[PDB]
Design a protein around this ligand. Structure first.
Ligand SMILES: [Mg+2]
Ligand SMILES: [Mg+2]
Ligand SMILES: [Mg+2]
Ligand SMILES: [Mg+2]
Ligand SMILES: [Mg+2]
Ligand SMILES: [Mg+2]
Ligand SMILES: [Mg+2]
Ligand SMILES: [Mg+2]
Ligand SMILES: [Mg+2]
Lengths: 258, 181, 221, 98, 130
RNA sequence: GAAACUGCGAAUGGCUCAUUAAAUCAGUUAUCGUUUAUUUGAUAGUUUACAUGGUAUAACUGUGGUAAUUCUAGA
């Protein structure tokens, strides 16, 4: 190609969006934004294929141009705006606030939250560095740069960002015993507690995570997101609480509730 | 272009179509079940072979294997639901003991014959293809329709059928009109 | 400006300024001939509109208002017996000035007066005072729809209480003087239309008193 | 305006309840409870089975097969009794077959 | 008799409407045209007919029942604002815009691409030349 | 609101497999070895002003050339 691509085939789209393979030939290409293309949910999919509020792309555009959707407290009018992990989506006219959190299956789940919970979000500290004029700043996972961070904040820590003012309220250090959320790999969407962090200089660090059921799994550090201390998450969790459950029991409880 | 839509063949030609004993076997199956052609027999045989090969592969696995337990249980549930496998025989070994006749009886044609709605298997076929038979509240015109245990008690003449309480067909009212005239 | 949007474009969606909407807006409910929910009633106007608004509006304030008043509005006699608490709740929620919930509340307030007109007279002064505060509050936050809801509700109350208000229209005018004399041209303009309906309905004898009083007042905006 | 008419009927109906006496509020719910298809006559506990005055009246006809009873009822919508005629005001009838 | 049952009802104040799936039982009848379904739905939900849209109706094999999708806008103006133009034309609320076939418009576009400016100067130039 | 100037796009998409045998490509690395429109977040009291020019032109008015073109000359 002689330049950046602008089209996305449905088969090539991220699997977790759950798009019909025969509905059309192309899928919404997320525009540039806070989150990466493969780890983002465009607003069109959320409003049409998840909430079912709109029946087609044009109706989604009509909703957006009416300025009823807010992302992180800001109005967005792009159909393919890349909303992502820990993103707050507010619909005032319908009066709901949603937090984009993966389910156990590995898919963004429609999780409704209260207003007081919608007032803040969490961000994994991807980078800390001194800017121009000797002003420290922190870059989070969603591309937010916050100046004058607390000196104790380091990489791999989590910062509680208030949406209205965009300032850090609290933070969590990355240490053993902390509650973590998996954001990648086939363990995507699971929740557990840190046990040990294995370090390899010049390589990818590995973290051992133990679930509430005592099952243990190892994951690369890049896919780990600290969300609080054990038993005290700073955000409301989706149904299932990030516990992976086998297939036989899946049959079992589906029958039981049925 | 749009993504492909998958397709598959539902029947396979036999290893040796020319065995005299075989030819007599399809003669029996077609004659007793009123099958139009040999392709129906081959289709049922192919489905049965797939089922029993899966059962054999599951048996080869060690007992208590999660894959074995899950998949064998699913297969037994499906076979019980369609009715080929009786309730008291819920083990993978008896699945290997199934026969083509078991599936053939569950065909809507044969069931219609047994229930007494038709005087011949061919009469059952013509009744089904002419939209006179309804399972539950819905009309089925396909002789190859497989009946479930729950569906078995709901087979009846369709509401729209002249035999099911609707007005007489075209021939009857035509004859009545000419007689009146 | 001076060449107003006389020639409309082919665009289906067009931007309109608040002043543009206000200039085009006019307070006269009767000219609107669209089918109204309250026209068809089984128990009461209030109940007929109350169920409908539950279907359309999902605002938090309205939902809270509905739950408090749901049990006491099932029947017209129940509304009459519990009229005091119903009016207090309606006034309480309107004062919050939540635009998401104003439309169902303002409509129900008019329909409330429709059910028990002569009984609403004891509520009349508070109802008008609540609207005046709302319309004054509406100036701070731009929403033309809020003005349309408020004044139509005022117009509706006049229509249902047309007989009683006409007898003492000078009192009704006295309440609306801040609106009629308000600095904004449109707020005075809208109020004038609402009060105009009462005037055209007046007996000549009652009118002569009203015209004398206003001329006495005439002796800002 | 028919709403005024309902108000008049409601007003007269309200005056009746005041003669019948919280109490007014509950009784208001009860009268319309026929519209809402739910049980609204909770009187089982207060009932007195033991003191029931029982009687058996012999009849000539054989194998009395069914009985139908007619009860005039005040209608809340129009506040008039269901009696066919003025002579039948508050007269209870029972019909029997054999 | 004909019965209309509404299922999977959703309230979309974003678009200011109510969505649902309409199931229509019509024994002894071929089917129900969109007009009667619209007037019955309008009566049931107490709205103006112009505010009711219905489409996508399929009668199952064997007849006797149909399934489609139905929309009820909160008022007529919003229906005009959001409803697709073609559905408006179906209901007669809007008039079909008459336009030339795509090939004619494309050919005209190309011919106008060839000319530069208003083109009157070329007209007078060729008039004087000939 | 035609025309024209201005801004953006036209480097996406669609088609074909000619060349290509550690080349392409698959998996897996690196940029402490570099560019990056756009989106998103930060970020600039230190630079006649009740606001400067044609150092200028299109569209447009008008005069024309060529057999001919999405050609264009002078004013
Ligand atoms: Mg490194
Ligand atoms: Mg037929
Ligand atoms: Mg240009
Ligand atoms: Mg080649
Ligand atoms: Mg070579
Ligand atoms: Mg190599
Ligand atoms: Mg751009
Ligand atoms: Mg920027
Ligand atoms: Mg020049």
């Amino acid at each position: 190609a002689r330049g950046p691509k602008k089209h996305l085939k449905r088969l090539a789209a991220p699997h977790h969006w759950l798009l019909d393979k025969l509905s059309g030939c192309y899928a919404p290409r997320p525009s540039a934004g806070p989150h990466k293309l493969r780890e983002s949910l465009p607003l069109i999919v959320f409003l049409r294929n998840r909430l079912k509020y709109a029946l087609n792309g044009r109706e989604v555009k009509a909703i957006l141009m009416q300025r009823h959707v807010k992302v992180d407290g800001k109005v967005r009018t792009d159909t393919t705006y890349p909303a992502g992990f820990m993103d707050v989506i507010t619909l005032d006219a319908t009066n709901e606030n949603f937090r984009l959190v993966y389910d156990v299956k590995g898919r963004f789940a429609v999780h409704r939250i209260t207003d007081e919970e919608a007032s803040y979000k969490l961000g994994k500290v991807k980078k800390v560095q001194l800017g121009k004029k000797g002003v420290p700043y922190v870059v989070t996972h969603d591309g937010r740069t916050i100046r004058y961070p607390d000196p104790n904040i380091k990489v791999n820590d989590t910062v509680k960002i208030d949406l209205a003012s965009g300032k850090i309220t609290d933070f969590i250090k990355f240490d053993a015993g902390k509650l973590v959320y998996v954001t990648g790999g086939r363990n995507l969407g699971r929740i557990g507690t840190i046990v040990h962090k294995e370090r390899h200089d010049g390589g990818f660090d590995l973290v051992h995570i133990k679930d509430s059921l005592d099952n243990t799994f190892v994951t690369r550090l890049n896919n780990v997101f600290v969300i609080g201390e054990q038993g005290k998450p700073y955000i409301s969790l989706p149904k299932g609480k990030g516990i992976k459950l086998s297939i036989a029991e899946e049959r079992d409880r589906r029958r039981a509730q049925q | 272009p749009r993504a492909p839509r998958t397709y598959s063949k539902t029947y396979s030609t036999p290893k040796r179509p020319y065995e005299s004993s075989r030819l007599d076997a399809e003669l029996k199956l077609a004659g007793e079940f009123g099958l139009k052609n040999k392709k129906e027999i081959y289709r049922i045989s192919f489905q049965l072979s797939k089922i029993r090969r899966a059962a054999r592969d599951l048996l080869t696995r060690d007992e208590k294997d999660p894959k074995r337990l899950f998949e064998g249980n699913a297969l037994i549930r499906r076979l019980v639901r369609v009715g080929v496998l009786s309730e008291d025989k819920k083990k993978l070994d008896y699945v290997l003991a199934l026969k083509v006749e078991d599936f053939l009886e569950r065909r809507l044609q044969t069931q219609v014959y047994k229930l007494g709605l038709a005087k011949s298997v061919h009469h059952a076929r013509v009744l089904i293809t002419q939209r006179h038979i309804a399972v539950g509240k819905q009309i089925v015109n396909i002789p190859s329709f497989m009946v479930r245990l729950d569906s078995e008690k709901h087979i009846d003449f369709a509401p729209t059928s002249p035999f099911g309480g609707a007005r007489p067909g075209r021939v009857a009212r035509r004859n009545a009109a000419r007689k009146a005239e | 400006a001076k060449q107003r949007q006389t020639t409309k474009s082919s665009k289906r969606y067009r931007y309109s300024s608040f002043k543009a909407r206000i200039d085009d807006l006019k307070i006269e409910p009767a000219r609107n001939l669209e089918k109204r929910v309250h026209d068809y009633v089984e128990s009461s106007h209030f109940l007929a509109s109350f169920d409908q608004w539950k279907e359309i509006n999902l605002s938090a304030k309205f939902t809270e208002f509905a739950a408090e008043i749901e049990h006491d509005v099932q029947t017209l006699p129940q509304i009459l017996y519990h009229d005091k608490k119903i009016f207090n709740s309606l006034v309480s929620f309107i004062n919050f000035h939540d635009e998401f919930s104003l439309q169902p509340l303002l409509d129900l307030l008019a329909q409330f007066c429709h059910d028990l007109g002569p009984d609403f007279l004891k509520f009349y002064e508070e109802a008008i005072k609540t609207l005046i505060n709302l319309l004054d509050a509406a100036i701070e936050f731009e929403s033309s729809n809020v003005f349309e809801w408020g004044f139509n509700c005022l117009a509706y109350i006049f229509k249902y209480l047309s007989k009683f208000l006409v007898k003492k229209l000078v009192l009704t005018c006295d309440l609306l003087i801040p609106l009629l004399s308000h600095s904004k041209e449109y707020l005075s303009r809208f109020s004038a239309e609402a009060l105009s309906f009462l005037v055209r309905k007046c007996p000549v004898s009652n009118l002569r008193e009203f015209v004398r009083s206003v001329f006495e007042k005439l002796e800002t905006n | 305006n028919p709403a005024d008419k309902r108000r008049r009927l409601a007003k007269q109906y309200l005056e009746n309840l005041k003669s019948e006496a919280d109490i007014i509020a509950s009784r208001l719910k009860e009268d319309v409870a026929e519209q809402q298809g739910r049980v609204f006559r909770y009187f089982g506990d207060k009932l007195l089975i033991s003191e029931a005055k029982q009687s058996f009246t012999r009849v000539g006809e054989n194998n009395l097969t069914c009985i139908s009873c007619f009860q005039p009822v005040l209608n809340k919508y129009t506040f008039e009794e269901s009696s066919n005629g003025d002579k039948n005001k508050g007269r209870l009838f029972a019909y029997t077959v054999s | 008799a004909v019965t209309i049952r509404t299922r999977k009802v959703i309230s979309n104040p974003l678009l200011a409407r109510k969505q649902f799936v309409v199931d229509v039982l019509h024994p002894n009848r071929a089917n129900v045209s969109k007009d009667e379904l619209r007037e019955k739905l309008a009566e049931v939900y107490k709205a103006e007919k112009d505010a009711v849209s219905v489409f996508g109706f399929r009668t199952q094999f064997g007849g006797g029942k149909s399934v489609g999708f139905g929309l009820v806008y909160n008022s007529v103006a919003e229906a005009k604002k959001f409803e697709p133009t073609y559905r408006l034309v179906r209901y007669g609320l809007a008039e079909k815009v008459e336009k030339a076939s795509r090939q004619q418009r494309k050919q005209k576009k190309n011919r106008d691409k060839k000319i530069f400016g208003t083109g009157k100067r070329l007209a007078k130039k060729v008039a004087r030349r000939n």
